[PDB]
Amino acid sequence: GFASLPILKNG
């Protein structure tokens, strides 16, 4: 779970 700017998301 990572929707937060800047978006650091492996998925």
Coordinates of C-alpha atoms in Angstrom, one line a residue:
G1 CA 0.0 0.0 0.0
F2 CA 1.6 3.2 -1.3
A3 CA -0.6 6.0 -2.9
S4 CA 1.2 9.0 -1.4
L5 CA 3.2 11.6 -3.5
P6 CA 6.0 11.0 -4.7
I7 CA 4.5 7.5 -5.4
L8 CA 7.2 4.8 -4.5
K9 CA 5.2 1.7 -5.4
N10 CA 6.7 -1.7 -6.6
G11 CA 3.3 -3.4 -7.6

